[PDB]
Amino acid sequence: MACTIQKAEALDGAHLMQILWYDEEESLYPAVWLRDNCPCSDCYLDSAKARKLLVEALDVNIGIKGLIFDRKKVYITWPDEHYSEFQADWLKKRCFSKQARAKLQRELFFPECQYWGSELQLPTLDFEDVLRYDEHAYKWLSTLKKVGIVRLTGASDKPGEVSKLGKRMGFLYLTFYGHTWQVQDKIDANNVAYTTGKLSFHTDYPALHHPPGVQLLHCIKQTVTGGDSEIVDGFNVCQKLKKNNPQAFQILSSTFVDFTDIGVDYCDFSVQSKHKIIELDDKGQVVRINFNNATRDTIFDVPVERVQPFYAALKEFVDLMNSKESKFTFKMNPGDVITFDNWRLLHGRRSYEAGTEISRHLEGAYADWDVVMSRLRILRQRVE
Amino acid sequence: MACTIQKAEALDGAHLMQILWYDEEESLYPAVWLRDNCPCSDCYLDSAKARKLLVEALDVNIGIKGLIFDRKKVYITWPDEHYSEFQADWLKKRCFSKQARAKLQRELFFPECQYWGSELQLPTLDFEDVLRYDEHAYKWLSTLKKVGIVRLTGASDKPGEVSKLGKRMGFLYLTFYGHTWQVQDKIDANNVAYTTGKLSFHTDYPALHHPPGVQLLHCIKQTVTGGDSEIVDGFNVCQKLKKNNPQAFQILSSTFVDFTDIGVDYCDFSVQSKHKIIELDDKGQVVRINFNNATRDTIFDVPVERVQPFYAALKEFVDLMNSKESKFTFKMNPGDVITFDNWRLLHGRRSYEAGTEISRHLEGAYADWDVVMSRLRILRQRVE
Ligand SMILES: O=C(N[C@@H](CSCc1ccccn1)C(=O)O)c1ncccc1O
Ligand SMILES: O=C(N[C@@H](CSCc1ccccn1)C(=O)O)c1ncccc1O
Ligand code: NI
Ligand code: NI
Ligand SMILES: [Zn+2]
Ligand SMILES: [Zn+2]
């Protein structure tokens, strides 16, 4: 009833079209845009969903010669005698109103996320379920996007589980550490020679210009005492950060920091990058956090007068993350696989207790948000 | 001599360290920075070049308690009785002056690059020489970065060559088209029921938020008349535009256009993204171009009043690219490999002579600029 056309006209100048639907809603469409998106086989390929029409063959000052219509189609003719047909629902979807434009975007990028601090309820799902049923994989990825972390439980106690979640999404993000990477730790109890420390909050691989979108951490076998994992919602924190200290937020969202990483793994390497600890989009919203104090280079490209104030804003930031109001604590169990957003969440670890025995085997991997995102859309279509 | 300290003092407040080299230049260093990048094993992890000192342990209001020095080192004690040693040449490198910073930056990211036009002289190198000699590999990458393109010659006539180059840089960039894709065209000698148009200028894969940085194109077999390759230097162009049409430039470098791509190759997919055709850094410098009219979505999230102006401004951009002074034409031959910057150059193809035998076979691959940059950093240190 809203996708049905009541009145369609080319207005004045013939450079714009007005569609009035049976729900008393009006839409405006630029002729030049209509010409550029003619559904005709000569201009578009339905299969590849690509446009054949060349820009060179596009009169930016084009105007509608004439048009007729019915309830679900608009017929347009142009000066060069070119013919086009547009579907009512196709137009409606692409309405230039602020609301229609906003709605379509929501439908394309799943921008809704749920903020959280220490009151977070860690989402859970079954590893094998996510593999066999799409209803679940959809629940897995859509939750990962909204919340930023999902705990898949019930995986084997051997390597190769993250690889399976890889095929499920599409493919992992190959880095200098390889396709996957195994972490292994073993310290006998009562050993006075060793000393364990905590792990300050961070995001992985900030030494790359395009950091890994999501991380996959499978816990094969783990026997520890106080190695509780900790995590904070970078977005939530940033919001609170500017609200409680604009000066800090300013500096961190505008000062470029250099990150490096040299070594040999999948090959010899030497990476460097410049990132702003708090990256914002052109509209001022936090889109990614880039921070790993261990990889922040000793080189700092900025005038001396900026240095001290910078370290101050960083301090305030790290303190805000450590406040119990921001950090969620939990513990991984053998067979579990953690999956989170590395642009959003910052993770760390508590301090292993005393001289207690510690032994763990973990397998990790990264995935790109474009791959996950693509998978999410295909999956949302299979489930709905 | 420039790395030789004549005098080093902790200016009043002890929040800054002033050093005067035997060459008469004075370098300033903030106390908090020195204390943050302490070389001591307890704070820094030399072998890994990673910081092990936590931010929580860094007093942003710290000052130097006392210090002594010789011609090649500075020794500093801190209030909390911590001890530090600094290398003079190490400090000389990280000087906060404008020049030093800009200098060290150049060493890290190879910013240099020559703009070009129709008067371009295509850099060439031998395929096998690049594979065996690091000097030729350095010449290959440095030029690629600097000029935007490099033509390797001598590759075999069988697939699997662009793979050897990948293993030479580090590793290829896997996309939805596998690790490598192939193109095989074979239109018979004088076919009447078929026509071959031209390819407009474009960059590849704008549908990804992180488009492929470098493209590798191997010409395995090509038997064609006409259809010459056409490349253009986007950076040069973008600059000429800003000069001739500040409005067009302003629009293109500030409007977010949608790009889409759905299909199946390495697996099914439905990638969607938003990009400013002319991407600028935070200093107004063009750092990347994102354009492929085919994969530019029919969806356009922008207020109607901006539509026509945008279309008008793109036509400007495209017309400038097709200008006789902006494009460089060349024809690739069998056995050679074209390697170019997919973020800078835009490529197209001329129209094949009508009714002429068309027989092609090429193998392509993508690479990430960070992987290439790493190889480039590791090679410079091996040839220089
Ligand atoms: O955070 C890192 N590793 C830590 C944590 S990985 C396990 C983990 C993952 C997510 C949340 C809490 N703990 C470790 O090995 O214990 C890490 N990140 C980047 C590079 C090297 C690392 O050890
Ligand atoms: O530009 C594309 N292909 C064209 C050109 S690839 C050969 C080429 C590469 C670089 C410069 C000129 N020609 C073709 O197959 O003839 C292309 N790009 C992205 C997706 C599909 C394509 O066919
Ligand atoms: Ni980590
Ligand atoms: Ni192409
Ligand atoms: Zn048409
Ligand atoms: Zn120290």
UniProtKB/Swiss-Prot annotation, chains A, B:
It is found in: Cytoplasm. It catalyses: 4-(trimethylamino)butanoate + 2-oxoglutarate + O2 = carnitine + succinate + CO2. Keywords: Carnitine biosynthesis, Cytoplasm, Dioxygenase, Iron, Metal-binding, Oxidoreductase, Phosphoprotein, Zinc. Its cofactor is Fe(2+); L-ascorbate. It comes from the Eukaryota. Zn(2+) binds at residues 38, 40, 43, 82. InterPro entries: AlphaKG_dependent_hydroxylases (IPR050411), GBBH-like (IPR012775), GBBH-like_N (IPR010376), GBBH-like_N_sf (IPR038492), TauD-like_sf (IPR042098), TauD/TfdA-like (IPR003819). Highly expressed in kidney; moderately expressed in liver; very low expression in brain. It is an enzyme of class 1 (oxidoreductase). GO terms for cellular component: cytosol; extracellular exosome; mitochondrion. GO terms for molecular function: gamma-butyrobetaine dioxygenase activity; identical protein binding; iron ion binding; zinc ion binding. Pfam families: GBBH-like_N (PF06155), TauD (PF02668). Pathway: Amine and polyamine biosynthesis; carnitine biosynthesis. Binds 1 Fe(2+) ion per subunit. Transmembrane segments: none annotated. Its EC number is 1.14.11.1. Its main location: cytoplasm. The modification Phosphoserine is found at residue 351. Fe cation binds at residues 202, 204, 347. One of its GO terms (biological process) is carnitine biosynthetic process. Catalyzes the formation of L-carnitine from gamma-butyrobetaine. Belongs to the gamma-BBH/TMLD family. This is Gamma-butyrobetaine dioxygenase.
